[PDB]
């Protein structure tokens, strides 16, 4: 019964086109609840789940304040980084930040994290101990020293270990019906003939939540991850996820192949035969 | 830390005063507060960074700017009797640092009258310890007294034999109103300096009660049959009697 | 307001424990501070707490209960120098406004072994046409009540510390500009012990 709250922040420079784009999305497990989009009109933090709308103006006022703060820092970061790497003003660049906290079945703090990436790859990240930084390069080292002097970690550790978990539980409870839910997959199989000497078996997992799932193809023991095709667990659009896996099986042995579905909404891992 | 000037200031309804505030901590978040007995601290204006300024709880009558991040001058264009209070400056790191603590400045005390003819310096006077106390306790308590000074802007100190003392001293925490029923009332301040009979009976001992008063500037023209109430140091004394 | 503190002077004896409470309303608060402000001086930061729990530093102990949105300050082995008014401050973020409390005033009275209350009459000042009355060496439980006859000024009791002779004494002075003023009636309105050595 583990859980987690995570925030993702995207910053994209718009060379010759004004202020950068800023997008902030908040999640609790695989369910999003808040968001901030510089392109949007409210120009404030907005709810994206029913259970968060019940919060007071105090909540949204301070959530919008803090999110704008993030924006300001990312707006300045884009320039700073462009400098460190002495890049041109001709190209677009991306900054991404991600912090959150994991709790166990008892909801007690488990892990904390705060990553920072630039142009698609790590730049700096807080270490598991929440006391030290990991610089990805010589430039990142400058941020590291800068941050050690500013006692930034000390602040994130306080947040990640307390406030973060404190509010995660608040959400987990307020959204009891929604978040503490655990929908089971509606599995099945489909046969597809492409040739006279072959066929395609597709194991399907649908309407399941959380997205955490593992589908496996097996020859009554034999692993077959070599000829299997798994598509990224995709969202359905109603809060549930989908996913499937297939293998090219020569006509005949197909009756010996069995699929394995592992999800926390299932007592015992399913095994589907054909 | 946070430095601000002036320390004391006298103004006539209508004068322009500018309280200077600076900080050397590379902070981006500076604020101005005014403290009064009935409300405590109240925000006037604040700035999260250079060029960005916003009003606070009581921004009326006050102007503020922030061209640089080191300074944050608070301005009063036309002083009003209501703007009489203590103004504290303050700064926070903002998005520049993780330490969330806000730091205050030393503070400036300002007073506004409707007519400077209310600015009077104090009249210091020392009172020798009674013989009664001298024998009953073998200790001597000298009591000083600053009185009639108007802007309750004063710093009193003792000086035995030429050096300031911090021993048996204990001056009141705040002035006293001689006319509690006024708005242009003068004040009085008390202070005690206690020493052992023996040290007070040494003829060679000279005691002085120094009272620093902050008032007008040698510039302010002053037309009155009395002496211009400039910032001065009024004192009083007494020597160690033989008795 | 948004932050509430104990409204009133919390008088505590030297060596005793002073306990300070505080309560805030914004559940989003993340930073909590305690400020010490001596009469006439600026607020001085003395304690910060970022996670709920206990933070000890010197004789100060700060507790934090986010669930109950409560903050405290325990001053151990109280010293008269701790006499000040304490401000409770809390905030939400680096851009949030600092919210202070009214501030709870703390008075640390000094131990007075042999309370020897008296009202001596100091005098002689060719410059001033005033006679001064000194009420000293009384107990910390003897509050000096204000005057009556407007033409009479009375100060509040203060504590003098004879650092060398290891001795501390309370006192309050009274003065006037009348040939009718006598130290006998001076502190009349106040409640003074019947051990008032009135020399004359």
């Amino acid at each position: 019964g583990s859980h987690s709250m995570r925030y993702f922040f995207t910053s994209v420079s718009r060379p010759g086109r004004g202020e950068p784009r800023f997008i902030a999305v908040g999640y609790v497990d695989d369910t999003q609840f808040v968001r901030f989009d510089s392109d949007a009109a409210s120009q404030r933090m907005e709810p994206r789940a029913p259970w968060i709308e019940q919060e007071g103006p105090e909540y949204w006022d301070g959530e919008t304040r803090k999110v704008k703060a993030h924006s300001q820092t990312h707006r300045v970061d884009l320039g700073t980084l462009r400098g460190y790497y002495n890049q041109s003003e001709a190209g677009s660049h991306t900054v991404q930040r991600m912090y959150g906290c994991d709790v166990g079945s008892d909801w007690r703090f488990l892990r904390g994290y705060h990553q920072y990436a630039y142009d698609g790859k790590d730049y700096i990240a807080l270490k598991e101990d929440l006391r030290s930084w990991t610089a990805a390069d010589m430039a990142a080292q400058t941020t590291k020293h800068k941050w050690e002097a500013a006692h930034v970690a000390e602040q994130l550790r306080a947040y990640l270990e307390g406030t973060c978990v404190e509010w995660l539980r608040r959400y987990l409870e307020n959204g009891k019906e929604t978040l503490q839910r655990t929908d089971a997959p509606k599995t099945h199989m489909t046969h597809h003939a492409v040739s006279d000497h072959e066929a395609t078996l597709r194991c399907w997992a649908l309407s399941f939540y959380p997205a955490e799932i593992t589908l496996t193809w097996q020859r009554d023991g034999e692993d077959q991850t070599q000829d299997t095709e798994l598509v990224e667990t995709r969202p359905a659009g109603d809060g549930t996820f989908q996913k499937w896996a297939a293998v090219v099986v020569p006509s005949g042995q197909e009756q010996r192949y069995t699929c394995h579905v592992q999800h926390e909404g299932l007592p015992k891992p399913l095994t589907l035969r054909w | 830390g946070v430095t601000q000037t002036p320390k004391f200031q006298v103004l006539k309804t209508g004068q322009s005063m500018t309280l200077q505030c600076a900080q050397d901590m590379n902070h981006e978040y500076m604020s101005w507060y005014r403290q009064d007995p009935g409300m405590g601290l109240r925000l006037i204006h604040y700035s999260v960074g250079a060029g960005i300024t916003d009003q606070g709880e009581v921004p009326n009558g006050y102007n503020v700017s922030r061209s640089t991040t080191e300074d944050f001058p608070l301005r009063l264009l036309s002083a009003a009797p209501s703007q009489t209070s203590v103004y504290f400056c303050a700064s926070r790191p903002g998005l520049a640092g993780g330490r969330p603590e806000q730091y205050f400045g030393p503070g400036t005390r300002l007073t506004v009258t409707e007519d400077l003819k209310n600015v009077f310096p104090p009249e210091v006077a020392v009172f020798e310890p009674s013989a009664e106390e001298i024998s009953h306790t073998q200790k001597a308590t000298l009591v000083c007294l600053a009185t009639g000074f108007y802007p309750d802007h004063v710093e009193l100190s003792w000086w035995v034999n030429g050096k300031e003392v911090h021993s048996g001293v204990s001056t009141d925490p705040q002035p006293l109103k001689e006319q509690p029923a006024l708005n242009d009332s003068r004040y009085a301040l008390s202070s005690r300096l206690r020493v052992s009979a023996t040290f007070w009976q040494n003829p060679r001992n000279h005691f002085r009660c120094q009272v620093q008063f902050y008032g007008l500037s040698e510039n302010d023209e002053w037309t009155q049959d009395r002496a211009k109430p400039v910032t001065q140091i009024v004192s009083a004394e007494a020597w160690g009697r033989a008795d | 307001k948004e932050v509430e503190q104990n409204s009133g002077p919390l008088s505590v004896p030297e060596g005793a424990i002073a306990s300070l409470n505080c309560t805030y309303s914004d559940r989003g608060s993340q930073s909590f501070f305690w400020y010490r402000q001596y009469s006439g001086k600026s607020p001085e930061l003395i304690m910060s707490i970022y996670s709920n729990g206990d933070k000890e530093d010197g004789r100060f102990t700060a507790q934090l209960n986010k669930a109950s949105q409560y903050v405290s300050l325990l001053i151990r082995d109280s010293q008269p120098s701790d006499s000040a008014t304490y401000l409770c401050a809390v905030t939400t973020d680096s851009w949030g406004k600092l919210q202070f409390g009214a501030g709870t005033q703390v008075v640390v009275t000094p131990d007075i072994q042999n309370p020897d209350p008296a009202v001596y009459q100091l005098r002689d000042s060719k410059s001033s046409d005033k006679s001064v009355c000194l009420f000293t060496d009384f107990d910390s439980q003897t509050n000096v009540s204000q005057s009556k006859d407007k033409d009479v000024y009375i100060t509040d009791k203060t504590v003098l510390d004879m650092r060398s002779m290891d001795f501390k004494s309370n006192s309050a002075v009274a003065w006037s500009n009348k040939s009718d003023f006598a130290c006998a009636n001076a502190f009349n309105n106040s409640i003074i012990p019947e051990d008032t050595f009135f020399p004359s």
Partner: peptide
């Protein structure tokens, strides 16, 4: 609830 002490890089 958002973190409250983001700092420049």
């Amino acid at each position: 609830l958002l973190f409250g002490y983001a700092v420049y890089v």
